[PDB]
Tab-separated table of C-alpha atoms in Angstrom:
chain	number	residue	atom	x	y	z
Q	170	UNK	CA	-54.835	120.291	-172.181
Q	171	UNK	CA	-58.527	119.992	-170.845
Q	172	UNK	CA	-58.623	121.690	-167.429
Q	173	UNK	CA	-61.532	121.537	-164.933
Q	174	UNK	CA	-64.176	124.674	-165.169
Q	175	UNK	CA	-64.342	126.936	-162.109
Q	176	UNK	CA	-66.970	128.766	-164.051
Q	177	UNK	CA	-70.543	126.867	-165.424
Q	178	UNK	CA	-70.357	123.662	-166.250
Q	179	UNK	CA	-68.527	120.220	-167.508
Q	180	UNK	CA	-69.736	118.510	-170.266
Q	181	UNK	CA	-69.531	114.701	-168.925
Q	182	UNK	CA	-70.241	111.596	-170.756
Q	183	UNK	CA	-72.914	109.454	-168.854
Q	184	UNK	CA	-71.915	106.117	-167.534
Q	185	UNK	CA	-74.113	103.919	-165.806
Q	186	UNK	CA	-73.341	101.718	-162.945
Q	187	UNK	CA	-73.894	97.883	-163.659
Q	188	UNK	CA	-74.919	97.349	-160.317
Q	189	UNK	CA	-75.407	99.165	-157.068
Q	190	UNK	CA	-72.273	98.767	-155.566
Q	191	UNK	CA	-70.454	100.323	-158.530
Q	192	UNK	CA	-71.301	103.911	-158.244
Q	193	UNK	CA	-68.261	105.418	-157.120
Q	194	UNK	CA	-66.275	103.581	-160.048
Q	195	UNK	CA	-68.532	104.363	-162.005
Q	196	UNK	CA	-68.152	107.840	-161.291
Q	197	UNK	CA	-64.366	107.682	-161.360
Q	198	UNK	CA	-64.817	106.588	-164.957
Q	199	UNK	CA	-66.918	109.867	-165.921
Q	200	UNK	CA	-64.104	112.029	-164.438
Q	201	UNK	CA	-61.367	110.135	-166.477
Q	202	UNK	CA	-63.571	110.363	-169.498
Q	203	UNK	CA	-63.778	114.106	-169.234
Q	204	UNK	CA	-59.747	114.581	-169.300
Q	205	UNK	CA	-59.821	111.527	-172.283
Q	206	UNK	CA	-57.911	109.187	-169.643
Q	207	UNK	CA	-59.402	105.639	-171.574
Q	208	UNK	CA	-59.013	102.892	-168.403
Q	209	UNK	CA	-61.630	99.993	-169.210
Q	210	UNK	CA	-64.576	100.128	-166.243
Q	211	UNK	CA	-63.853	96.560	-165.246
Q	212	UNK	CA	-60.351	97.833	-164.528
Q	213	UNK	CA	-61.760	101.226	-162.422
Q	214	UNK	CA	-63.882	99.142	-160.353
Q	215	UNK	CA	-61.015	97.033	-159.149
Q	216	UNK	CA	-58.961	99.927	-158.497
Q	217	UNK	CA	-61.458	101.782	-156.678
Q	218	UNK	CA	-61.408	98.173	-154.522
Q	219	UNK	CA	-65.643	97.773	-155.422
Q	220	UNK	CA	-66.133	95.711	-152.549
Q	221	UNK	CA	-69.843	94.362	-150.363
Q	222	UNK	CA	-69.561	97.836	-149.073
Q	223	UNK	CA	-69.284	99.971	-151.995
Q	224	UNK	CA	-66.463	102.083	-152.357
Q	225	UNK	CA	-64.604	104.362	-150.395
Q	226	UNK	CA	-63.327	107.950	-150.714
Q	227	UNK	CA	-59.598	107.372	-149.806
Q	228	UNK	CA	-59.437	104.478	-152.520
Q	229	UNK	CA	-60.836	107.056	-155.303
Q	230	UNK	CA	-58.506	109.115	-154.820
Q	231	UNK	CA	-55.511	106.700	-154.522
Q	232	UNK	CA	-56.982	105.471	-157.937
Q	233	UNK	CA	-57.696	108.579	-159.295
Q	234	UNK	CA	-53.687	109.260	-158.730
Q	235	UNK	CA	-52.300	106.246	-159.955
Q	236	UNK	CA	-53.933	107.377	-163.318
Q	237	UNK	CA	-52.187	110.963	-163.645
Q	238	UNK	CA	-54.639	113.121	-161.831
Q	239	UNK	CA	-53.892	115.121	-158.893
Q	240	UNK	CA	-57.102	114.508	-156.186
Q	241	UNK	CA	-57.799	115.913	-152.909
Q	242	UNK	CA	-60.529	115.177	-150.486
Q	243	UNK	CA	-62.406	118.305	-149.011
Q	244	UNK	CA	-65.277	118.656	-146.310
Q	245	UNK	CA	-67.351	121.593	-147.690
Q	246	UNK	CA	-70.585	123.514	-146.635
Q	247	UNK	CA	-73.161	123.389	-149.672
Q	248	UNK	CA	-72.307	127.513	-150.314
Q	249	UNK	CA	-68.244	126.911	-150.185
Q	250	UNK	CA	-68.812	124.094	-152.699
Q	251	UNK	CA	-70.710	126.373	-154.825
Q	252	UNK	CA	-68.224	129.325	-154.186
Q	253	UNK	CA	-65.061	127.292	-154.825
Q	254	UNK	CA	-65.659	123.828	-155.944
Q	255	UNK	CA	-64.694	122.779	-159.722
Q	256	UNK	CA	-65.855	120.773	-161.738
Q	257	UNK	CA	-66.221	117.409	-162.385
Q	258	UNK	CA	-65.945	116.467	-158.881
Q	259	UNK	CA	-67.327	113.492	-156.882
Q	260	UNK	CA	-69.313	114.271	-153.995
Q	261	UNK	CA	-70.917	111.911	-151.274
Q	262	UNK	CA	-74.712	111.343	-151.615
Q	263	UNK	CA	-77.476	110.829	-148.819
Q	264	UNK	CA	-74.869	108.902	-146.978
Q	265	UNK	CA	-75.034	106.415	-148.993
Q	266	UNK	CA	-74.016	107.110	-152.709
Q	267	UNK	CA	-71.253	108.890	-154.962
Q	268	UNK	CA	-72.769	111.130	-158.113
Q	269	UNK	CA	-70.422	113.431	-160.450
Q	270	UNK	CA	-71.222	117.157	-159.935
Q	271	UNK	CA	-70.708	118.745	-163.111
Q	272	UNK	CA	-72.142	122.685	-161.724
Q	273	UNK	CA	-74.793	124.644	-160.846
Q	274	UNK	CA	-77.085	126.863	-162.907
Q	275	UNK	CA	-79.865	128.803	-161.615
Q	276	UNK	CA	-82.022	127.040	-158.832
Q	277	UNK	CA	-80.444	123.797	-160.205
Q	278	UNK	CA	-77.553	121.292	-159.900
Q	279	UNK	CA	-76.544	119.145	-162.575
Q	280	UNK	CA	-75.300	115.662	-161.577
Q	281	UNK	CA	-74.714	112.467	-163.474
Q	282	UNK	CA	-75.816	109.935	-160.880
Q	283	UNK	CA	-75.002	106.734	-161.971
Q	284	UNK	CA	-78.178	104.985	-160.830
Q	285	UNK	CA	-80.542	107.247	-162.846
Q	286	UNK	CA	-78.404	109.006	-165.629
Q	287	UNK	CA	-78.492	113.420	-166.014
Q	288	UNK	CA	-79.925	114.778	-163.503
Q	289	UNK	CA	-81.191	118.296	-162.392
Q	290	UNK	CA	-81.195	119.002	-158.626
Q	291	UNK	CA	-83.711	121.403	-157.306
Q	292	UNK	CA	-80.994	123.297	-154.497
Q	293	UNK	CA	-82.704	122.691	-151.887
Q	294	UNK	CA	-82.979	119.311	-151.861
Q	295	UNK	CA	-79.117	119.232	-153.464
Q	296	UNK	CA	-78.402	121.114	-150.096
Q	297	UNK	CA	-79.650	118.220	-147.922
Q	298	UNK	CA	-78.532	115.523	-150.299
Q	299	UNK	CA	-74.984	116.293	-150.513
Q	300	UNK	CA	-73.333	115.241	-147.279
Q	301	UNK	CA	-70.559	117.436	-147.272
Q	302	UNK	CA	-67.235	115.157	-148.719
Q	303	UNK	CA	-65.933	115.941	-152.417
Q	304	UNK	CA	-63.330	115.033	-154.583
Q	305	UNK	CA	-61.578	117.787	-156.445
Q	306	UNK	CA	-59.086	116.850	-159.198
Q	307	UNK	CA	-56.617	118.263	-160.943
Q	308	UNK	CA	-54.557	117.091	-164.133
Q	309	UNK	CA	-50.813	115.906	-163.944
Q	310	UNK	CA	-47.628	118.269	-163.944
Q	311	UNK	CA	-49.411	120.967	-161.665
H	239	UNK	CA	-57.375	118.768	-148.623
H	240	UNK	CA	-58.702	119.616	-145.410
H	241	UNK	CA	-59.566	115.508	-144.540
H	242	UNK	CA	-56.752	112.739	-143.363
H	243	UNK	CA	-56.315	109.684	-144.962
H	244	UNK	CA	-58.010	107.643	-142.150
H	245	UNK	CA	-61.249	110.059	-142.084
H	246	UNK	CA	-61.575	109.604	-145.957
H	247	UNK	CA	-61.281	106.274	-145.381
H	248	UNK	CA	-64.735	105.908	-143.741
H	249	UNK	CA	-66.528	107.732	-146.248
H	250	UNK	CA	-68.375	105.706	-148.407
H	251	UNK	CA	-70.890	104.276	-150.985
H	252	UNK	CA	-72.557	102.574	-153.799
């Protein structure tokens, strides 16, 4: 029954990465957490194929699928993302990085990045931070 | 969505 928001913003338990490669199962795990989808970490970050290079966004995805969610990869503009994104997603991070975008309010976006926890985003520097990839899901049937 | 399997394949991170 829980859908994504289109509207203000997820509430989405924070979960840490254990180390600095983990981020993008680690934010995996905060998505399936929001639709109640209980997979033990250890089991997202092999998966997600955690590897000396991080993660990448096609094995999310796959991942993300295997566990009853419908995902999609877009390339969006900051202002699209805003206009049409919903939320959770996972979007790409100073090249580098994968944090769970939970919405925007006012001046602000709110993140849980899993190397520092809930986080507010001054836009501007969300603008230049977010490198343009995001992962939309979806639950099952539709 | 609007990205091939191959070009999210490349995109990455910690």
């Amino acid at each position: 029954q829980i859908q994504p928001v289109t509207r203000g913003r997820a509430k989405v338990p924070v979960i840490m990465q254990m180390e600095a490669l983990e981020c993008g199962a680690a934010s995996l795990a905060m998505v399936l957490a929001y639709y109640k989808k209980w997979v033990p970490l250890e089991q997202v970050r092999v998966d997600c194929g955690v590897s000396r290079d991080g993660s990448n966004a096609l094995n999310v995805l796959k991942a993300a699928r295997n566990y009853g969610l419908e995902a999609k990869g877009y390339r969006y503009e900051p202002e699209k993302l805003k206009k049409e994104g919903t939320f959770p997603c996972i979007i790409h991070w100073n090249f580098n990085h994968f944090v769970v975008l939970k919405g925007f309010k006012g001046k602000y976006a709110y993140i849980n990045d899993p190397a520092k926890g809930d986080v507010k985003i001054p836009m501007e520097e969300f603008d230049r931070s977010f490198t343009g990839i995001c992962l939309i899901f979806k639950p099952t049937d539709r | 969505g609007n990205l091939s399997d191959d070009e999210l394949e490349g995109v990455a991170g910690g």
